[PDB]
Amino acid sequence: FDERDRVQKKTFTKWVNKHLIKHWRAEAQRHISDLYEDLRDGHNLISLLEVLSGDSLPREKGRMRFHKLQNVQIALDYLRHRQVKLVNIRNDDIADGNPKLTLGLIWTIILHFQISDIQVSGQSEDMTAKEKLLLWSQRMVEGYQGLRCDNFTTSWRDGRLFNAIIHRHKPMLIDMNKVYRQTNLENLDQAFSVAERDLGVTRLLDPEDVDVPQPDEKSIITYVSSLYDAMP
Amino acid sequence: FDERDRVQKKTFTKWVNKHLIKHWRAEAQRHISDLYEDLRDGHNLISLLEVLSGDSLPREKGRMRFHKLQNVQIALDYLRHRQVKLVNIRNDDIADGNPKLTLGLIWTIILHFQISDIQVSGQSEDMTAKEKLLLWSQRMVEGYQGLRCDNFTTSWRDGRLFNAIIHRHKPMLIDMNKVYRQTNLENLDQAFSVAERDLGVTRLLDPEDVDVPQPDEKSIITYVSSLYDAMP
């Protein structure tokens, strides 16, 4: 048991749910309760992809295993036709609720549709999307006294970076002096509540899951990438 | 002027020189004095590729510009023929001694022949070569108290990671308690000396070029990759 897999699942669940409610068809606006059950018939996975891309996709409405395997295949074929690299995931794995491969698939979707469009001044061309986001993060908190961004895990635990990023962007929203004397939990909660109320950024993370010696990397990157998106 | 470019040139020169002396024809066992002069005629570049690949390659012996440009074309064609992504390099650039494009070429060679070989359990497959090497480095230093590997620059500055990677494989060679007590210069000297004496790892880096606020990334990745090769 690694608690980061729990956090990751929660974060991806909130991410998927944020998208499904934006669907234009009212019957597609569903809510994931358990990420390892509610994608098994492929319907929410096809809906997710319709919202992220703006395309319509075909789907089967029958209820046998054959229909679920096919809905999943439609989704994975869609992704393949957009040159996403899906390796070692087959339709049965998703239809059957395999935890690790379901998490792998959603990460693949987040990476392809949200993270891999990032553009930062000072970009090398051999830089990875992750590297570009870390560079963006480092540039955003450059003026600020105690602060370093070394990674997407431990650097973020104390909530100061999240606050500093939002401050840089709109100094009105954040009292930095106060950040320097508040606890981790207070700083995290303050940054997440401001980002949601004032920037439109869905709360993907709970402070209790970030204030931990080894936070889940993909969850942090997903949230940080969602802040980047909220800044013109 | 960025001092890292000086370090990178020095690192790459030592890396090229370590290979040229392993050529099977004695006449090809040459020594690079200045990397921006001594590849211009193409002979050393063809020899390097011969030793890294095991293949014999054609070569021109004349001394006009025509011969130099052709020797260089033979090398770059060989590389294209092996599906190496060269972009923005011609003939002329290497024959004229272009510093940036000469460094870029050698980096492309190091990356294709030495670094892209890495394998460690629990890779993704969307994972880049550098990401695999970083994962390896993170794993190798997991048991060690206050050590973290976040990148291939500032994490390596103090010499502790080099000393830990070696201790993990040969615990008798280094005293980790002395490591936490020493200066960066001592730690780096000791790790590179031990690596060379007992593990056959050529010293590509001098301590004073690593113990700096911003170490050259490609130089460190080159050396770390050399450490990986000298393990089981």
Side-chain angles (χ1 to χ4, degrees):
Chain A
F1 181 53
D2 180 343
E3 203 176 343
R4 298 119 127 189
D5 296 332
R6 179 194 57 71
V7 175
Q8 193 174 115
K9 187 195 188 185
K10 188 171 153 177
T11 314
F12 293 182
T13 294
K14 290 194 165 158
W15 188 91
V16 171
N17 281 347
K18 138 184 193 67
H19 292 291
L20 296 176
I21 59 166
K22 291 169 71 69
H23 204 282
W24 56 89
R25 297 180 11 244
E27 47 267 296
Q29 291 167 10
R30 270 139 56 68
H31 169 250
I32 302 301
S33 288
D34 185 340
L35 189 69
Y36 306 157
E37 284 284 353
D38 292 339
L39 304 175
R40 290 175 58 227
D41 75 15
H43 281 333
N44 290 324
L45 188 61
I46 287 166
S47 313
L48 177 59
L49 264 15
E50 295 183 319
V51 175
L52 292 171
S53 73
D55 295 319
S56 271
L57 298 205
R59 53 171 89 219
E60 306 293 326
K61 11 183 113 163
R63 283 140 96 277
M64 297 267 272
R65 185 131 197 287
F66 291 89
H67 309 308
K68 301 174 161 61
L69 283 176
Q70 255 320 288
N71 281 159
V72 177
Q73 200 65 244
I74 285 162
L76 304 175
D77 281 344
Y78 181 78
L79 285 171
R80 276 190 240 96
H81 194 63
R82 301 192 43 140
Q83 299 215 279
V84 183
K85 347 71 126 284
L86 254 11
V87 83
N88 297 143
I89 292 166
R90 63 203 147 69
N91 49 338
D92 293 60
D93 298 316
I94 301 310
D96 288 347
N98 189 123
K100 168 205 153 98
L101 294 166
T102 296
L103 290 177
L105 205 207
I106 299 310
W107 173 242
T108 291
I109 293 178
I110 291 168
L111 197 56
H112 181 87
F113 289 92
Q114 185 174 122
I115 301 171
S116 78
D117 274 359
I118 291 161
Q119 266 138 60
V120 202
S121 52
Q123 257 175 112
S124 321
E125 322 80 82
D126 56 349
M127 280 187 327
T128 261
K130 187 173 156 172
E131 278 177 331
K132 288 177 218 219
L133 191 70
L134 183 66
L135 181 60
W136 179 83
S137 297
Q138 289 174 339
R139 290 207 196 293
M140 292 295 276
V141 306
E142 243 169 38
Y144 295 83
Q145 35 139 240
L147 307 192
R148 209 156 35 111
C149 188
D150 294 317
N151 57 221
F152 287 114
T153 55
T154 55
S155 292
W156 302 80
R157 148 189 225 324
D158 74 12
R160 287 170 200 210
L161 258 21
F162 286 121
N163 277 285
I165 284 173
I166 291 164
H167 181 264
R168 186 61 146 63
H169 176 269
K170 287 204 202 160
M172 199 73 264
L173 270 2
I174 300 296
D175 187 338
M176 275 314 289
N177 305 298
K178 172 178 280 141
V179 167
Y180 285 112
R181 56 183 162 69
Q182 269 178 343
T183 62
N184 296 357
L185 243 19
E186 293 179 321
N187 279 337
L188 288 164
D189 188 48
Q190 170 183 124
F192 300 159
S193 306
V194 171
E196 188 197 57
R197 186 205 260 115
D198 294 300
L199 302 181
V201 178
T202 304
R203 269 172 129 290
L204 303 180
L205 304 180
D206 301 328
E208 300 83 2
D209 293 333
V210 178
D211 188 20
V212 107
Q214 286 280 290
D216 182 59
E217 190 176 29
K218 300 179 182 181
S219 294
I220 300 277
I221 290 166
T222 295
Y223 187 72
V224 175
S225 154
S226 92
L227 295 163
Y228 169 91
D229 266 8
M231 298 167 181
Chain B
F1 183 52
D2 180 341
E3 201 170 352
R4 301 118 115 178
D5 294 339
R6 175 196 67 65
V7 174
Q8 189 172 118
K9 184 190 188 192
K10 182 169 167 210
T11 300
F12 290 2
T13 295
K14 301 183 176 234
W15 190 88
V16 171
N17 279 341
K18 193 232 317 320
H19 297 240
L20 291 183
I21 60 180
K22 305 250 172 242
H23 205 265
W24 52 85
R25 281 193 304 290
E27 301 74 17
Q29 294 171 2
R30 296 213 282 144
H31 176 251
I32 305 290
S33 295
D34 184 344
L35 197 67
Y36 310 153
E37 285 288 354
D38 294 328
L39 303 175
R40 288 170 65 225
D41 77 12
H43 282 326
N44 289 328
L45 228 203
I46 286 164
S47 301
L48 173 64
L49 291 179
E50 289 184 321
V51 358
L52 292 170
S53 69
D55 292 336
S56 279
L57 290 174
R59 175 184 307 249
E60 304 300 326
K61 292 286 202 331
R63 342 208 46 247
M64 312 294 287
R65 192 110 185 295
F66 149 80
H67 311 295
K68 298 178 190 194
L69 288 175
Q70 184 62 212
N71 274 336
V72 170
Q73 190 72 267
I74 290 158
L76 299 180
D77 280 346
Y78 178 75
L79 254 26
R80 288 189 265 260
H81 195 31
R82 282 167 122 275
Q83 323 192 345
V84 178
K85 202 70 118 212
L86 259 31
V87 82
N88 286 161
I89 295 173
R90 46 245 169 76
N91 262 229
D92 299 84
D93 292 314
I94 302 308
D96 289 348
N98 192 117
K100 176 222 235 92
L101 294 174
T102 303
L103 290 180
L105 203 221
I106 301 300
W107 174 242
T108 291
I109 290 171
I110 292 172
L111 200 58
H112 172 100
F113 282 93
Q114 166 167 147
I115 292 170
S116 74
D117 283 343
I118 269 69
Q119 52 156 221
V120 68
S121 54
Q123 306 141 321
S124 207
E125 231 146 314
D126 74 322
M127 256 176 33
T128 251
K130 172 174 161 182
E131 290 182 321
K132 298 176 212 207
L133 190 62
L134 189 65
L135 216 212
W136 178 81
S137 302
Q138 279 164 350
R139 289 243 203 95
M140 298 290 293
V141 304
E142 244 170 352
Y144 293 84
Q145 255 344 114
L147 303 197
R148 203 167 65 256
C149 187
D150 294 314
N151 54 50
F152 285 117
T153 55
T154 46
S155 299
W156 297 84
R157 178 189 197 331
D158 68 18
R160 288 171 186 197
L161 291 178
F162 286 123
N163 278 282
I165 283 167
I166 286 166
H167 178 283
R168 173 62 116 105
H169 261 86
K170 254 45 163 16
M172 51 319 260
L173 260 10
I174 77 112
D175 199 304
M176 290 298 302
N177 283 294
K178 217 200 174 60
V179 171
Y180 293 109
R181 190 149 186 74
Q182 282 163 334
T183 69
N184 303 353
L185 283 174
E186 289 173 330
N187 281 336
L188 287 168
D189 189 46
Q190 143 188 145
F192 301 154
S193 292
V194 174
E196 183 190 41
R197 286 165 195 157
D198 301 304
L199 292 158
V201 180
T202 304
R203 266 197 171 226
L204 306 174
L205 306 173
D206 293 324
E208 35 282 323
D209 289 338
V210 174
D211 181 26
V212 302
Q214 275 314 324
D216 182 59
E217 193 178 19
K218 296 178 197 191
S219 295
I220 290 188
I221 290 164
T222 303
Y223 187 69
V224 169
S225 187
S226 295
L227 293 181
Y228 168 96
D229 281 352
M231 308 320 187

